[PDB]
Amino acid sequence: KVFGRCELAAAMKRHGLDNYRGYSLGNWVCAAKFESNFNTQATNRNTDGSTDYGILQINSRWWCNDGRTPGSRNLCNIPCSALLSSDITASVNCAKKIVSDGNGMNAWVAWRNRCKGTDVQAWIRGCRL
Ligand code: NA
Ligand SMILES: [Pt+2]
Ligand SMILES: [Pt+2]
Ligand SMILES: [Pt+2]
Ligand SMILES: [Pt+2]
Ligand SMILES: [Pt+2]
């Protein structure tokens, strides 16, 4: 499913992302825009053989099992394919664990490079929450 901007923002809040670990909802939406273009099915293979999965492009090296990432962990205890569903619960729950792991949202490279320090509120302006 390709979410609408305000549609994803709605669903992110519902699942508890607004000010999660101090990250306002605008940050989560901007990160999703740039990680996946709001598409729950987005996949992107990394040079290191791991793959990024879903709206927030969660990586198979640490967070999920795809059965092809050598010497990898499944810290979120899911199959990576769960991260591609039109229901974002799994992506959100695994992101809560990532963003708590201690580098906060810097664990999303597109977030550090494109959202961090910007007017993130724009991404939620016009939506109902
Ligand atoms: Na893994
Ligand atoms: Pt939830
Ligand atoms: Pt803020
Ligand atoms: Pt694996
Ligand atoms: Pt939902
Ligand atoms: Pt809207």
Curated annotation (Swiss-Prot):
PROSITE patterns in alphabetical order:
GLYCOSYL_HYDROL_F22_1, GLYCOSYL_HYDROL_F22_2
Return one GO MF term: lysozyme activity
The tissues where this chain's protein is expressed are given as:
In the egg white and polymorphonuclear leukocytes.
- Write out the residues that bind substrate: 101
tRNA-binding is among the record's keywords: no
Q: Which Gene3D superfamilies does the record cross-reference, listed alphabetically?
A: 1.10.530.10
**Which residues pair up as cystines?**
6-127, 30-115, 64-80, 76-94
Entry's Pfam families? Lys
SUPFAM superfamilies named in the record: Lysozyme-like (SSF53955)
Keywords (alphabetical) are: Allergen, Antimicrobial, Bacteriolytic enzyme, Disulfide bond, Glycosidase, Hydrolase, Secreted, Signal
Q: Which GO terms describe its biological process?
A: cell wall macromolecule catabolic process; defense response to bacterium; defense response to Gram-negative bacterium; defense response to Gram-positive bacterium; killing of cells of another organism
Domain C-type lysozyme intervals:
1-129
Chief location category = secreted
Superkingdom of the organism of origin: Eukaryota
Active-site residue numbers: 35, 52
Q: Where in the cell is it found?
A: Secreted
**Which reactions appear under catalytic activity for this entry?**
Hydrolysis of (1->4)-beta-linkages between N-acetylmuramic acid and N-acetyl-D-glucosamine residues in a peptidoglycan and between N-acetyl-D-glucosamine residues in chitodextrins
The record describes the protein's role as: Lysozymes have primarily a bacteriolytic function; those in tissues and body fluids are associated with the monocyte-macrophage system and enhance the activity of immunoagents. Has bacteriolytic activity against M.luteus.
Any extra detail in the entry? Lysozyme C is capable of both hydrolysis and transglycosylation; it also shows a slight esterase activity. It acts rapidly on both peptide-substituted and unsubstituted peptidoglycan, and slowly on chitin oligosaccharides.
The family classification in the record reads:
Belongs to the glycosyl hydrolase 22 family.
Q: How does it assemble?
A: Monomer.
Under which name does UniProt file this protein? Lysozyme C
Q: What is this protein's gene name? A: LYZ
